[PDB]
Here is the input.
Amino acid sequence: SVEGVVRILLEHYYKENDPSVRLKIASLLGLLSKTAGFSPDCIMDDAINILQNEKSHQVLAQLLDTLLAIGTKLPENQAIQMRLVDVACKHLTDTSHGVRNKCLQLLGNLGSLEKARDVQKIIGDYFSDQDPRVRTAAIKAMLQLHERGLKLHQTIYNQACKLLSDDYEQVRSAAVQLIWVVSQLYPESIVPIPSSNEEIRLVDDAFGKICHMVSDGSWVVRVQAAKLLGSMEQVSSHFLEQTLDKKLMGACGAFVHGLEDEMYEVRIAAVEALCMLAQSSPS
Amino acid sequence: CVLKATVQDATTVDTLLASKSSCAGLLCRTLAHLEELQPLPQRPSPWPQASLLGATVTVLRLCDGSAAPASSVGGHLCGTLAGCVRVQRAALDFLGTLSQGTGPQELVTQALAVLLECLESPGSSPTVLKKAFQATLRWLLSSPDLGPLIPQFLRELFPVLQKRLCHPCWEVRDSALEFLTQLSRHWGGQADFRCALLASEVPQLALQLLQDPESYVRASAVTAMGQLSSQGLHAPRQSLFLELLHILSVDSEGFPRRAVMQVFTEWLRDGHDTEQFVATVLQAASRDLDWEVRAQGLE
Amino acid sequence: SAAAKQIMEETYKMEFMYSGVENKQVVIIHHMRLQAKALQLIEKFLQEVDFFQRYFIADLPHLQDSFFLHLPLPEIHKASATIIEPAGESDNPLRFTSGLVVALDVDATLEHVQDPQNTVKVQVLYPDGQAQMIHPKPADFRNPGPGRHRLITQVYLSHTAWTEACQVEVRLLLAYNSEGTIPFSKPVKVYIMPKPAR
Amino acid sequence: MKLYCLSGHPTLPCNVLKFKSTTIMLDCGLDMTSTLNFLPLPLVQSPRLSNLPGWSLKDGNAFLDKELKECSGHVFVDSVPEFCLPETELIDLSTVDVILISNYHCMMALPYITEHTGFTGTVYATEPTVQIGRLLMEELVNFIERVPKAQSASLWKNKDIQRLLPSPLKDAVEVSTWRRCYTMQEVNSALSKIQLVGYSQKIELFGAVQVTPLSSGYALGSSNWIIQSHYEKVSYVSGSSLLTTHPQPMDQASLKNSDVLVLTGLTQIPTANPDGMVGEFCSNLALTVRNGGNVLVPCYPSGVIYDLLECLYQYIDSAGLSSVPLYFISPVANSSLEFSQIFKLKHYPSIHGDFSNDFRQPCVVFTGHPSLRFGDVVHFMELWGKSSLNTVIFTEPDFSYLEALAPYQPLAMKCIYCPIDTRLNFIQVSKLLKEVQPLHVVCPEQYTQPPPAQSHRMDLMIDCQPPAMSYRRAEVLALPFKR
Here is the structure.
């Protein structure tokens, strides 16, 4: 008796005008959507009809949440996924931040793994959005997309590096994670330091950037970077040994600045990184 | 009027629902008047006693906070008079004025069944327990050996005379001892009352109070233990005489000395070695500096 | 009759207390368990052999002529427990008062145990006959190195009123769920001495 | 503007204030009376409770004879005490951006919220409240996990079977979201996210909202929040006291011009005089110490105890009680007394070790958690539960005392009940409302209707005009303001 009561409650939502009661009904729909063995795909069109004329904010948020929940339930029906991508890009421009969070999560979990719009660039445009929470969710969606198996492009590093000087907390950790993964993608590429005429491997740039990032005034990001340095093997050894010259005191001398930082947690993370990078290179 | 607002003209009930000041004032004035009238011979006829007592116990219990309203006026009244003093105090004064009123033991037990409740009621000021004890005494001393309910009520009461005897405010620590003394003077030859008392643990606390800091406590404690040990109700006589003479020889106040001399007068007058006793009290009451003590010594 | 129970316990020890068993060894030991249950029989047997058949659909072409069955010796370490602190040999007992707790610090190393956080318990025996089975918390199993683990924990000794100084038993146990307990450490007797309170 | 009220409890508040941009979480708390349906966690094997008659179902379709036990007319679940929790279904707990805090007695549920489900914000709290909160969470994690009893009980948890078990268990609510306690590393990492804030220290939020605490006089650092904007002002005042205790007395004048006064955390004993009940406490302690017997006074190792002790001190010199030690047994004693001092009683870390060499009877022993279900109080309540001389004296309104005392019946010790609640009572809150003149009021359903036990009274309902909108457990109210 799923579709019957669902249609009754939708006719209620149509006639009920109070947004709080509407959200109650929407939460009921979201909780009933998880019936294993039921076909709520018959109701996806109706959900799109609901979102095509909304005036509130949270309603679209949890509705696209249900749409993402059901899309994750049948990820093989690529037509449904393309329809979801379409309605999301339709709703991506919305002014509210929660709905944008939901659409970016939908794109991250339901992006096209084939190399027909460039969802990568559409999402990447949002590293310059106003509310930093939107940028946080954007980087999280980038991570989700990559971890599903899609190989990413080179430019993401060059766009993310700009966020390294931002004045917010989670954004910097997400940026360091993005640099880490994208450099694990394109390590050996040659990038020139714009401060001189020298050209070093992109892995070396990533390493030096993370080292300097460890010198941030926040400790969460320091833990994050100290840990993420742990598995960076292919970086050239001379840079590494330069990262312990205590005499040079941020791309170098990071380990010394860490192993005596205030909060012992970053110290421990630096110990782990030293252990790994020493197991890899005996000198 | 109130007893049409509980479970057994509107001019007065108007002011009864105006505020907490006006209602308390009206009820206090009415109880003050209605008790000022009782001891008079020109009293009306027939002087009601059932209705009066019923209304009074209802008012007292209501003020304690455990009545049972039966209408809007009863509800709002229980919600305005709850936890007052003036009403409760004057109500105890009336309900204790009702001793000259003759009648069966039914009324006596009706009134004790609320006074016992008003004694062991948490949230009861020290200016309430005193009048409560006075009223309980006048009630317990007017019941026509003893009766079928006296021991029951005493068993239910002494576990309240054992708590309010250690209240943390010396007013109660004195009123309780005074009430115990009134009993020990009115009920010294009733072996059933003595069963009730010795079975309780009152004297094992009075015997310890004589070291309380605040002087008046020591004074009333000495006079209580005096009017007690003239009966043979000692807690589990010399082991009190030594305590007395010690309080008399050195101490930091007057009241205990001038009260222990009164107690010694009581003993020597009643008949409770006598030469050496008078010597060891006189030769250590003379060199005392206060005047009341030397006066009572001459007495 | 008790020889069947001994078979069961030896199969239990070969299953759980050991490390590095392969599916072949599991087939063999479950076959021994089937033999043990069939022999202790002299209703549930049919359901249990059905369960055996369902979980062992692959070994059936390999258990030809079963109820001798070859046991391959794979490549292996027998786990054990070494109760150290305290020794208990000290004539100086542990003092306690007339009805109250008393703390006992157990400090014992384990070697080549398979994830001790779950399968280890401490058992306390009073000479009367009761048994306290204290499961130890997660964060009390320290990790000093490969194959070696350290267990430092607190055990609360008391009971109803005690008259004279006596002995109590504290030992280790390996708990398994196939529901059962295997004793694999030499027990330690601790001497407790009374002194009624002031 | 929206108000997702989660915790239906009346004095352990929690509610998600959803705003224009941010979604703040005013004072997520932890309902803790759920531990009353479960058996205790005694230190040593308790011979009376290990051999209780295993209660049996009338039909016996299942083997419930191992889960539920019967004692003197009440049947209990046998497990670890599975605490209650704020519903985690209405709003996803990741959208929350900032979690404020009022005072320690309401923060016991931060580990459940900001560690298990992916929370991304940063919580604010004054300094004394974060200290005492660390202390309380420490005693909890150290009490539940000293003799773990992880053997669970799951058959009873279904709705169908639940509807066939009598009271008190049929009275349980939302039995599907009950959890075992959290662990040490969890709370230690969770409290790291704290960012201390002083009084009147204006804090901004995304160029959109502004928050600021004010001293509230309930306890050290206890605070009433103010969450205002360019067009709206919400004045959270949760559990304030106007009786002038040690804390800096509240600022009842800053809350004017407000738009929504989410008033929560009022008294639970409306018909109880605090001063009189403290007098009763001292009275009973003296009555059962001056005859030989002991006394066992459960109380949290913070808060009202610092009130209580103080009075007891003023009682020690006004009744001559010099010859009776006064203990404090809890694994957070030292830091507790230090944080009471730097902002006769012989405190001890734990009943095992040093304490067993200072035991002189008679005595007085304040102890661990006051729901008579774990900590140390269980051990004494199994030691003194047989002598009609001894005495327990409850001084905590949180856990209803009847069922609490129940699973140690039949007991022959007295059990006084004199609760000390320094919180705002109803006449005072009526005066406070008429003074502050809030434009609206939001109070749990336990208030706008008179209490259940005393249905005839009509004066302990919070009287305010316009009528006070109320909320029920896990509801989503709309404060009817239009921009």
Remarks:
- Helices of chain C lie at 2-16, 23-41, 44-55, 116-119.
- Residues 23-41 of chain C form the longest helix (19 residues).
- Chain C touches chain D through 23 residues (CB under 8 Å).
- The two ends of chain C are 55 Å apart (CA to CA).
